[PDB]
Amino acid sequence: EVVYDKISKRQRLRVFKHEDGSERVLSDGDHVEVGQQLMEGSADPHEV
Secondary structure, X not given: OOOOOOOOOXXXXXXXOOOOOOOXXXXXXXXXXXXXXXXXXXXXXXXX
């Protein structure tokens, strides 16, 4: 299981299309695909 270490509360959680269901912000227990972005902001393109 993957661990993303620490993110400041300054980063608002990503409200995303949220396939396998509705359109809403990220809550605990949600199901995430291989490419989905977890936080709101800018994603590293080396990562992608």
